[PDB]
Amino acid sequence: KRFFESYHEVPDGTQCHRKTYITTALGGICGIIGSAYSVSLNPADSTLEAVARVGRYTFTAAAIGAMFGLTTCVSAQVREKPDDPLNYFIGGCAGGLTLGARTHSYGTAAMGCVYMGTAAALFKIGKLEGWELFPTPKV
Amino acid sequence: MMNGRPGHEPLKFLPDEARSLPPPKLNDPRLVYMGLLGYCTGLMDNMLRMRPVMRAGLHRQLLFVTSFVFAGYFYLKRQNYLYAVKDHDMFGYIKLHPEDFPEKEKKTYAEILEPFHPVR
Amino acid sequence: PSTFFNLTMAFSLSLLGTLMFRSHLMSTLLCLEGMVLSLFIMTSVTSLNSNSMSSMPIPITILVFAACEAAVGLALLVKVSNTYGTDYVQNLNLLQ
Amino acid sequence: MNNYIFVLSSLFLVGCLGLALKPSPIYGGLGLIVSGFVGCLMVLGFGGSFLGLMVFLIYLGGMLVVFGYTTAMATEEYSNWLILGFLVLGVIMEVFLICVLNYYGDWLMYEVDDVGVMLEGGIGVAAMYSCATWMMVVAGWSLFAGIFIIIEITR
Amino acid sequence: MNPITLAIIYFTIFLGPVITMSSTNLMLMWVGLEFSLLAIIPMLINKKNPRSTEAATKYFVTQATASMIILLAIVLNYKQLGTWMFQQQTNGLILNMTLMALSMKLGLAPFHFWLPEVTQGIPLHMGLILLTWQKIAPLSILIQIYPLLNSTIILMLAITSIFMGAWGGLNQTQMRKIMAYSSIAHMGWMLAILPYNPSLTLLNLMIYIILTAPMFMALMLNNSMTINSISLLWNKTPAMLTMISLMLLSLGGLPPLTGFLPKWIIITELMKNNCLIMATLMAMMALLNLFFYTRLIYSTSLTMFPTNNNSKMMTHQTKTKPNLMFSTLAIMSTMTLPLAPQLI
Amino acid sequence: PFLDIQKKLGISLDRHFMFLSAEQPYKNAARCHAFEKEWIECAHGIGGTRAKKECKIEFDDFEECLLRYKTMRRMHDIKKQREKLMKEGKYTPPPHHSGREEP
Amino acid sequence: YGLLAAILGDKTTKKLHEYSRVITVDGNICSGKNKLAKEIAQQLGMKHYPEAGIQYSSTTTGDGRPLDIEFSGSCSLEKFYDDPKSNDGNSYRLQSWLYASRLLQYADALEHLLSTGQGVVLERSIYSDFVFLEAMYNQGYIRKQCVDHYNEIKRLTLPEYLPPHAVIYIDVPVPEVQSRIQKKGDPHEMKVTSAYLQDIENAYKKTFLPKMSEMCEVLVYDSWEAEDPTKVVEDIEYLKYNKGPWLKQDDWTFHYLRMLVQDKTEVLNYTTIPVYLPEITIGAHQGSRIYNSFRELPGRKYAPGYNAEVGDKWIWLK
Amino acid sequence: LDLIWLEKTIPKSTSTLHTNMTTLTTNQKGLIKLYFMSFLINIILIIILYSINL
Ligand SMILES: Nc1ncnc2c1ncn2[C@@H]1O[C@H](COP(=O)(O)OP(=O)(O)O)[C@@H](O)[C@H]1O
């Protein structure tokens, strides 16, 4: 776990390699989990068919992970701005686009771009403003 | 929260300590609301059971307006206590642990420079 | 000691079982019971090496409640192979 | 043989493994019987007698007996071999895991009152009748209700 | 049911939650849970229709394995602390088990699959008990142990439930299942504030009970398990159309009605505790719940669906009345908001 | 607990037997009875939030009477290294390990 | 009547006697069953229920004065005959209302049987209604789905009620009935295509009679046996009420059945199921008007006992 | 821009987005095995959520 966290430690826009790798893993992990629920429920017809679906979901998710990581990191270096939430939006923007492609739908890319990017941007803001998620009870 | 307080009455409704608090005036708007809340329950019942809405169960209407209200005085009497305990508890702590709640002294405006953002 | 980790994993292996049906309701009702045995054994074991005699009542209360629990479970099972001629779970898919 | 305890635990684990594989309901019942036997053994190993007996006269007794009865009625159709194979697969994996800590009966009967006269299993559970008198009332109500639940659910 | 049996069962279904609540020895809390499991199964199969046996056999297996997991937590604690009850020291995994298990009996979040299906095959009446007098027991166990449970998991199960409940409800047209789905959702809010202010869980429950109990006795007054069935309410009994309208919008959070308070104070408490991330997302999809509530509103009240001639016949005959509880629980529920300060 | 119908009614059907140091049948004290007392008369009047830091000496000890793991550890080490000393023929059990003794 | 009453006595078990049975007499459009019924009734004091009518429910409820046609579902047997295969489908609406009417009649009959203990002769019953629909579908009168909708209502409601103890039956060949029609002259009843009468009896003969034979006592009578209530009555008193589902009706089982018939709103709960076949549909605008108008009739605007128009008093304390 | 583009983007899209979710989330076999394993997955993830955030 010390791993994933690393993504945040080094300043954004720097060491994109590690960023993309980490982002790709998270997506892939989600892919596995997502495929699992998708196979446990709404099962397949043959073991192979399901192994394929696991692969499909895993790769698609890994891809959205990569492009998000790559776009955000690169957008940063190029723009010479490491804390501009927009960076992430461009990244989320891209991530959605990959999802759209893997689903072969321009429309999905639309919703995907806006919704996904917005979400990622909010993550950046969240980190920038020190928003706390799942907080301990401090009343 | 307020449970676990010293002296807590394990299953009592309103500990006698609540005697010290003023009793709720019977016409307290709230108890009067409960009354109206009640009359309406009564009227509603008549309606759902298809009876003349207002001219029926004039005995029930009374049971309702008088059950809800009865409940109120004795509930409000308590909720009032609970809130009163909350201060007793809150104010006390502010003192017993004074340093944590220190009386700060603000400066007058003459000294405070507040930023001016020109609308223009 | 380790004795406890075997029993605990026995309960998890029995856990993995009840949560993965294999077309036999009876078998499940039988796996479910494998847990109760593992719980009964573990409760009895620690109570015995803690010399906590005040608690031995529990090891048995666990079994008494578990037995009836199973009685109910089997009556449902008999009810099912009276309505569908089998205990097979697939049949239980009307509530979709 | 200090390993005696570990040996038993392993057997128990293996038996539950079989039940886990969900063999024929009858095979499952048989497996549990073996495990229950192992179980009473372990409990007795610690020193508890009455306790060990119970599982025997309750599980090795009717608990599986009715199951058995039951299965005869609702289980008609007999890969068990494959299941047996996976069982061996699990056994070695189980063994492998213990061998993992291998590279990396010492303390039982942790404490005992060498001289004692009224200590023994069952005495504590005998206190269901005195100073624990709420366990057995609730258990009795459980049985007295269970009668009714089963009679209607069968009805 | 031989009235004697009816008594024994009903007593158990009622001794079941009460033992849980009263006792402190967890064991005695477990058997309280066990008795509830045994008592509910007979009533569930009263019609003994093929759907029913399916319902009970699912409810029972889901309930039984969760019961066994709760017992394992108590058995493990007994070794990590001689006590038969969770303490500050309790291993975190020990408590998390209890959360998952108890969240299965209550049916929250990723374990929300059994409830909608058992709510679909049981009568409307036993539906209420299965939804509201069987949630009191497990919640009691959680509320008692709140200081110790994890804020992260609860929140995840909370948010998930809200979403699953909402999304599930949108598609459903069977009423029993619309309610099952709502209960999953409300149950979610309740478990969200448990780690922070248990006292509010007990409000978000009562209000749910004072809202759902009138709503179901409404569904059964005409015994309509279909929206199409509840839509012809205007012909079968016109008066309940007004309150059915407000109670359902009250079940969702719309501001004038009593239903806003639980969501409002839960949001106030979560923001007081700084979860302005979590609280925001919950409130937003909470708005999805009202959409399916209002879609039903449309069919039952705001628009009059066509009815059947044979209905004129049912009008003729005197309609067996709705119990008084409906009224007292419809009004105290649709409009108590002016009295919120005391409620909390 | 959630509804204390027990304290109110004064009955004690569920409290008398929640910890090891509670009355044992025939007055036969259970194991560890020396610590749990010391760890609950300490945490009495002090709530949990403060029964978890300052009354940590008594739980760290009671966590060792029962689990008795540090002992296991120490002893296990003694065993392993003794094996190494025997390995170097440095040590072998004396008649102390095996000899006659008082009643 | 409720568990409370049942718990303390009030058991149908203590109120049943040999003469206490559900006996229906079914025949063609004119089997003289009306006559046989009254007599059998007179014989054992059986409450003789009249055949179910369009306004039987209105006579059942409140004042009992006949309702306006549109208030009673706008059904005409008269129009049934003069306009078969009508565009508006009055014939199916007539049949569906008839099934609801006998459902009310059968339930009222069962309530009298379990409370009083007296038996009941109900002439035609829900059990013997299908023959009209079978003949109507065999003819152009009703279309296939229409049939399915009636069958669905029948399957949903009829099983709950216990079967007729015995089902006295008359038979008079189609020629006979047509001729019998001519004697009581009515333009509408007169124009009933024989084949349709052929289809009605055929169903009893083939479907209804053997169906119930296994379930209840079946006494078929030739016209000659008929018109001799004494003989038929004698035979009923002769048959042994053994075979049938009635054997298992213990007191604790009857209680629930009683509480059903005791609630008319439930008896026909499934008669109003929201299946939208076009003939059955009220329609919201027409249905709302008919309701505002049926609900405004004196004594109907409020529950029985509370409407002052008809002279109810004490409303302010009820 | 009125009608189609400003109705397809904000009002209609949000209409479409969620309906898909319910359809995918609510298309369930109804079989117990499937549902249950999902319980398995959950236990696994929660076990981890605790593990990694130990
Ligand atoms: N399903 C039905 N459809 C049309 N008419 C019916 C139906 N059931 C009963 N009837 C009417 O009932 C009448 C019975 O004939 P009637 O001579 O009045 O009594 P009985 O049948 O005892 O001789 C018939 O004229 C017939 O029109």
TrEMBL record, chain A:
The keyword Transmembrane applies. The keyword Nucleotide-binding does not apply. GO terms for biological process: mitochondrial electron transport, NADH to ubiquinone. Signal peptide: none annotated. Transmembrane segments: none annotated. Coiled coil: none annotated. Disulfide bonds join 16-73, 93-113. GO terms for cellular component: mitochondrial inner membrane; respiratory chain complex I. It is a multi-pass membrane protein. It is found in: Mitochondrion inner membrane. Keywords: Membrane, Mitochondrion, Mitochondrion inner membrane, Transmembrane, Transmembrane helix. Complex I is composed of 45 different subunits. Accessory subunit of the mitochondrial membrane respiratory chain NADH dehydrogenase (Complex I), that is believed not to be involved in catalysis. Complex I functions in the transfer of electrons from NADH to the respiratory chain. The immediate electron acceptor for the enzyme is believed to be ubiquinone. Belongs to the complex I NDUFA11 subunit family. This is NADH dehydrogenase [ubiquinone] 1 alpha subcomplex subunit 11.
